Amino acid sequence: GHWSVHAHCALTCTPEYDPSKATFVKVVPTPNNGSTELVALHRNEGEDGLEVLSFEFQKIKYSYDALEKKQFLPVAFPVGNAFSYYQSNRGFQEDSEIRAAEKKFGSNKAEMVVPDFSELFKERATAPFFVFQVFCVGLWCLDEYWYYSVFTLSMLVAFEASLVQQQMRNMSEIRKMGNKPHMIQVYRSRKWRPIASDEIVPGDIVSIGRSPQENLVPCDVLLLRGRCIVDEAMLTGESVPQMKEPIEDLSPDRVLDLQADSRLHVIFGGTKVVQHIPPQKATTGLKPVDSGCVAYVLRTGFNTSQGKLLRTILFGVKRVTANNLETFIFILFLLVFAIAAAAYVWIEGTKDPSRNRYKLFLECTLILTSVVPPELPIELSLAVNTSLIALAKLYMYCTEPFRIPFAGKVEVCCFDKTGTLTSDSLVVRGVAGLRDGKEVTPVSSIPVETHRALASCHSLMQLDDGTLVGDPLEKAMLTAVDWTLTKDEKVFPRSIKTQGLKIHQRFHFASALKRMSVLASYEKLGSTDLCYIAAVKGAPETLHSMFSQCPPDYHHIHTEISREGARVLALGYKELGHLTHQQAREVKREALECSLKFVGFIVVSCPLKADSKAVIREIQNASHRVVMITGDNPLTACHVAQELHFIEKAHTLILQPPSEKGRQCEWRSIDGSIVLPLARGSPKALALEYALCLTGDGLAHLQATDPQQLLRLIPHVQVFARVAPKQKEFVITSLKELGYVTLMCGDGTNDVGALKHADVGVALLANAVKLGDASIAAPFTSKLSSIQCICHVIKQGRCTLVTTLQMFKILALNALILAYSQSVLYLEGVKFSDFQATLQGLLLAGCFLFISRSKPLKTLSRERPLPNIFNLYTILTVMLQFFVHFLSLVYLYREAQARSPEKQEQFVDLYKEFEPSLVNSTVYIMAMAMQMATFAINYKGPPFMESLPENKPLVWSLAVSLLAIIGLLLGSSPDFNSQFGLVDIPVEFKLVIAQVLLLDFCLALLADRVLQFFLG
């Protein structure tokens, strides 16, 4: 189809090479994705005298940089300009130049293109396989087999129309998620205008706000000023809304990076606005009529994140393509036996001079067309569709079907304990470090300084309804604190006679700094002066050095707290003395951390889910390896891992990078008793001796020193800890490079990048639907917080893979039987009339459809599905069965031919049509027996799928086929077999026919089962 396009383009107009004036330019799709297309260039007048030829591909604009690069390049977006310049940037000033800029840089239309069902059918009809099929149908027409042609063409067009219908049903959903265009209050020509969403262009300044109609954010915008409560669920999927901070406070020397500064300052498109905080009237700047937060438009068109993902959804694949090498080699092998049969056909026919040659070549081509089954990719699509529909009932969505089959081949599965293996809600047991010893004191008895430190240090927010929403950790601590949080960022104690604390501004968590700070002031008792007190929290290991005064048992108590597995978080509070109002704005975010005072720890219990234990046990029972990738304390992860039996060795040793440069890395055990430096040899012996786990800092050190030993060590490691999001992508890709099929289950925003690159990925959304950033483009998407989705998806993958193997085997045997039977038996002047091979076509169609709908078991088993069709078992069984059936067929033919009386007249009138015979009867009955035997023998039952009797449709179909075979062989009803035009056989030789049929069936069963037993 794609190659068929360029011939038409060449015919319409010649390709043009000269860059002076090109009428049309071919578009290279690139192997990753896309399709071959031709686009007409756009010629525009240049105001400055410089012309640019432009084209649009997938609604993405690219330009020929005739000035510097002399090549096609995408249009540069205003995001690349300096952050400080945009701070100083005012925006456009006049409307004529506004249309000038809109025309010259293009526009953005969030509406998508939905092809018509007729158009979709026409576009699918160009596929090579449908053309091959319709050619074959025409060949059956030419061989006078008119009924055969009409039935096969009807079935093929019916299935293609069914595919088009399900494609249209999917397109209807994409239409449903489409966002209707709407008016927006935007700043242009030094004024505010009512402007529709479609006509927004980058460089515009828009003051967005909480729309009374709950209108979604049109596109990505950069929050210039003000605070806003934004619900990024439908895009990002975090149940916790992410705060947005104004950039006027940001330093001008900073250079904006999308990856680093995405969460707190740039407002993504497609999100829903809940509440916007208006800036103070004292500040001088952009003044909006609607009193909404002013924002700058960075990215538009489909180059925005939501647009990128949904356009990749649309123009990525119409239907899943599975024309892999295995299918090609299957066709090739069946075609090899086809060519052998056809060669015998031609030779034996040419041995006879009387018969026509052109007709003989016609049935030769008929045999060839019959060999390649017209239903070959149809049932692969059917099996994938049935698997998808079955997997749908488990409340789990699948954005892309194609790596569903990859689920069966999984060997190593990755898990995250944060939020996925443990509930995020949890509970707080107390506040530690405020009393002598390792004992944790209740929240009631902790000092008031700890009370204010815990209460102030929170990023929680208040909605219009005022419901408390935020991080479950902060949620739980404030619940223990019990101080009310008001919409005015004032924290009031419920039962404590202390003045409330008003948070002036919040510094949020940074991954690199591993800390966050809160800056606020409290009124002194008996005076109106404002005393600024700042409470901070973060990584205890980082927070230790920043304490000015610290107890000696800090690391000791931290070690024992992490021993229990409870999440430990150090609390800090600095006096800071008295501060002025302006100086509070003056102080930067990295200055609050210095000269801190220790306040104590907090123990945060992580409750391991009970349902986790059974699924982990089952997945280890599946001859699979499980690896833990998480970010908390490494020995905390060790406690979690041993609790779920992730590690079963006598001891486990942690890896640390050495304090001094040039020192060889040395492991230390959890108890610390066993210490051994890393050896250059294989860690297999140590792994047998004890379990190994890697820390994130050690991971970085091993990356920086030499990747080789790291690559050797990764496969045998069970626990990964303190791993930042980039290094999770690192570890997933590293596991993939070893060749093991990778499965990962993640929920947090840190896991998006890793789930992007995993071979099979599932994303879990709490509560609910959120439909997170990953879940848009994750391989799979699950709505249930439990991780039973892992075992369910693995089971479905096993089932679909075994079904595909089954299907290829059935098609191979059945095609070979029908092909050889027809090929030689037409040579003997014995061809099927319309009714009988119509019947066989119905039996094949019905049996294929019923076996396509197999059901799986309830529990998985230790045995592993075969990797693919390319294994010795399949080829050896197909050949052994084929010879076992071939010998029987040859015996039947010779035994019959030794019996039928010869021709009465050598020359037969050409006008005479088919007249019934007995060889017809024997060959058709034997072929039916062979199809029945194929279906009965090759159905692999437990423990990979249900038993043979359980699949009631297939049992009924096989029973009907066997009843038809037995009734025809008996020939009890003369009307019945007369309708089929089958001549009666003498009973003395139904005896032999039945005996040889049973012998063939039993030999096939015994041979196949003994082969399975020997090569299991």
Catalytic positions: 416
Q: Kindly list the strands in the beta sheet with 293-297, ordered across the sheet, starting from the edge strand earlier in the chain.
A: 191-196, 183-188, 205-208, 293-297, 221-223, 266-267
**Tokens standing for 970?**
């008996």
Selection from 137, 139, 112, 110 nearest residue 269 by Cα: 110
380 phi and psi, to 5 degrees?
-65, -45
In contact, 781 and 763? CB cutoff 8 Å: yes
Which one-letter amino acid corresponds to residue 887? L
Under the phi-then-psi rule, with left for phi > 0, alpha for psi from -120 to 50, and beta for the rest, what region is 829? left
214, 272 in Cβ contact below 8 A?
Answer: yes
Provide the token pair at 390: 């079955």
Q: Assign residue 49 a region: left if phi > 0, alpha if psi is -120 to 50, beta otherwise?
A: left
**920 CB contacts (<8 Å, ≥6 apart)?**
830, 831, 832, 833, 836, 981, 982, 983
| Residue for token pair 């008031």 | 448
Q: Where are the beta strands (DSSP E) in 162-264?
A: 183-188, 191-196, 205-208, 221-223, 227-231, 242-244
d(CA 549, CA 551): 7
- The residue behind tokens 């020192």 is 663
Cis peptide before 943 (omega within 30 of 0): yes
Q: Is 713:682 a contact under the CB 8 Å cutoff?
A: no
- Distance set, CA 370 to CA 260, 338, 375, 933 (Å): 60, 9, 11, 20
Cα-based distances in Å from 528 to 135, 449, 523, 575, 586:
93, 21, 6, 18, 22
Round to whole Å and give the CA distance between 678 and 20. Answer: 64
Cα maximum dimension of the chain: 130
Specify the DSSP class assigned to residue 268: -
H/E element holding 668?
strand 666-669
Return the number of other C-beta atoms located less than 10 Å from residue 13's C-beta: 11
**Helices and strands (H, E) in the chain, number of each type:** 31, 36
Closest by CA to 798, choosing from 847, 752, 746, 857, is 857
Q: Measured between alpha carbons, how far is 640 from 619 in angstroms, rounded to an integer?
A: 17
C-alpha distance from residue 875 to each of 179, 193, 334, 374 (Å): 53, 72, 12, 22
Which is nearest to 519 in space by CA: 577, 470, 460, 587? 587
Q: Is 461 exposed, middle or buried (0-12, 13-18, 19+ CB in 10 A)?
A: buried
Both tokens of 328, joined, read: 């090609």
Please state at what angle helix 834-851 crosses helix 952-970, rounded to 10 degrees. 160
Tokens of 100: 């000038």
- How far apart are the C-alpha atoms of 745 and 421, rounded to whole Å? 9
Q: How far apart are the first and last CA of the chain?
A: 43
Contact 945, 851 (CB under 8 A): no
Q: Which residues are part of a known binding site for Mg(2+)? A: 416, 418, 747
